Paper text:
Aminopeptidase N (APN, CD13) is a transmembrane ectopeptidase involved in many crucial cellular functions. However, the exact mechanism that leads to APN-driven MMP activation is unclear. It was previously shown that extracellular 14-3-3 adapter proteins bind to APN and thereby induce the transcription of MMPs. The family of 14-3-3 proteins are highly conserved eukaryotic adapter proteins, which are involved in several hundred protein-protein interactions and therefore a plethora of cellular functions. 14-3-3 binding occurs usually in a phosphorylation-dependent manner, in which a serine or threonine of the target protein is phosphorylated and subsequently able to bind to a conserved basic patch within 14-3-3 (21, 22).
We identified and characterized a canonical 14-3-3–binding site (site 1) within the flexible, structurally unresolved N-terminal APN region using direct binding fluorescence polarization assays and thermodynamic analysis. It accommodates a canonical 14-3-3 mode II binding site (site 1). To investigate binding of peptide 1 to 14-3-3 in more detail, we co-crystallized unlabeled peptide 1 and 14-3-3σ ΔC (aa 1–231). An unbiased composite-omit electron density map clearly showed the exact location and orientation of peptide 1 within the binding groove of 14-3-3. As the structure revealed one 14-3-3 monomer per asymmetric unit, the biological dimer is generated via the 2-fold crystallographic symmetry. A superimposition of 14-3-3 phosphopeptide complex structures revealed that peptide 1 was bound to the common phospho-binding site with the identical N- to C-terminal orientation. The structural analysis of 1 bound to 14-3-3σ showed the expected orientation and location of the peptide within the protein and allowed the modeling of the 14-3-3 dimer bound to the complete extracellular domain of APN. For the binding stoichiometry, we observed similar values when comparing 1 (n = 1.05 ± 0.02) and 7 (n = 1.13 ± 0.18), which implies that one peptide binds to one 14-3-3 protomer (or two peptides bind to one 14-3-3 dimer).
Author numbering:
A (entry chain P), B (entry chain P): 39 to 46
C (entry chain A), D (entry chain A): -4 to 231
Amino acid sequence: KNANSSPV
Amino acid sequence: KNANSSPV
Amino acid sequence: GAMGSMERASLIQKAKLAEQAERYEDMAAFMKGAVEKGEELSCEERNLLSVAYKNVVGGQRAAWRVLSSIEQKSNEEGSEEKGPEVREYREKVETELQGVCDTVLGLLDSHLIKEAGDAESRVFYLKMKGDYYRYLAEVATGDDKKRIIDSARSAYQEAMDISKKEMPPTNPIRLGLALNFSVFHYEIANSPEEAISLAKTTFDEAMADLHTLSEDSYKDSTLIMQLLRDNLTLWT
Amino acid sequence: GAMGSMERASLIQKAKLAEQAERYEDMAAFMKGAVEKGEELSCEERNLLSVAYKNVVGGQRAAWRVLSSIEQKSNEEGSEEKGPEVREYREKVETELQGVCDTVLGLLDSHLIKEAGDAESRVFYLKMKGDYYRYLAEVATGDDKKRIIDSARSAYQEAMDISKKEMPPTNPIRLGLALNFSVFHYEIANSPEEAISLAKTTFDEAMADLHTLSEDSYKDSTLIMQLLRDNLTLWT
Ligand SMILES: [Ca+2]
Ligand SMILES: [Ca+2]
Ligand SMILES: [Mg+2]
Ligand SMILES: [Mg+2]
Ligand SMILES: [Mg+2]
Ligand SMILES: [Mg+2]
Ligand code: NA
Ligand code: NA
Ligand code: NA
Ligand code: NA
């Protein structure tokens, strides 16, 4: 994955 | 898992 | 629906068991059944719904990325022709991913968003709507790509407007929304400067509000703030 | 079958793509379609078939163990009554696991084992037959439990007899068969001494044959020998 996104 | 088994 | 005969409470109970068993497809089907009972979802139930579908689509997205990479390499100069199988199988995974996104968007439209009056629930669902249009955008190539992107942008923007008016800057859903909207700007909308600006401002406004929080709230907020910082480290 | 219209070679190609994408349910469906073309499987194709179903059932077994543990705790003294949901959902996962095992055993019986004349293919398939009866045995509780256990034992025993006559003690399939039959003795047949004896003798006879092997064969054999040693460390 290219970037961090929200866990929820 | 209780023990090691074969990878194939 | 196949869950129509099961009690709402039993569906929620089984969604929690499926999570413990890492059976996320089951978890999503149980939570879909719960949504289709027609009652609003509690905070914990909204989290179960999101976790379930996040894991299902997350596996699909990872597979799609593997297959798209193979497909791209097959179209490079000097690459041996291997027939239609790579494209076919990428399309298979893509169509299944699109189907899950359509299912989630369908639940949000029937009728979770309409009945969400509190800021926390409305922002949560509008963020979800942005997220699943963003996942659709990751694979879109046709004449609907611009419309998919604008649908994600529109949902995120409405969520941002409510969240800024009604929630503290440290609220974990506000933070996760800003995080995801910033990723949308960087990865989808070809707007890295907007992505970086949003992550920076979001981080700084949360930092200034940490002093108001209990130890446990502090931990929840700093967890998401660290993801904003991680992205800024990737991007700058 | 749903794969009836796809070329055998395309099914094998897509099984390899599914493996790269960690899409093991797809991988298993592709390999089932390939088996159902009616031709024998090459060594590489047998490995793809096994890897695919091993991963599918492995996830099911892990989920079943989580749910069975929760169910067992619910039946302890002082545990609050929570209704039928834990049992129902354990049964759901159990029935799906049994269905996959039945599918694999069906492929072995129609007609992979019958047409396997070479030692390597026949031992591979008989080991698989033992394995999937062993997975059925892990969840069996009724009046067929003894028959399921004996079906696993019978398949493993036939594979052992052929492997001892026709394959070197370092052959990775012979080693993996002995490893799994030893686990069957320890975990299923309540025969820990037999399990330990088999693992020891298998390890020692392989050690004595390593000198005959190339560097790459040596690596393949010692990988499985290490699993025998790991089990002996657990068991002694
Ligand atoms: Ca396909
Ligand atoms: Ca169930
Ligand atoms: Mg009811
Ligand atoms: Mg309402
Ligand atoms: Mg043909
Ligand atoms: Mg033959
Ligand atoms: Na091809
Ligand atoms: Na508020
Ligand atoms: Na209950
Ligand atoms: Na031989």
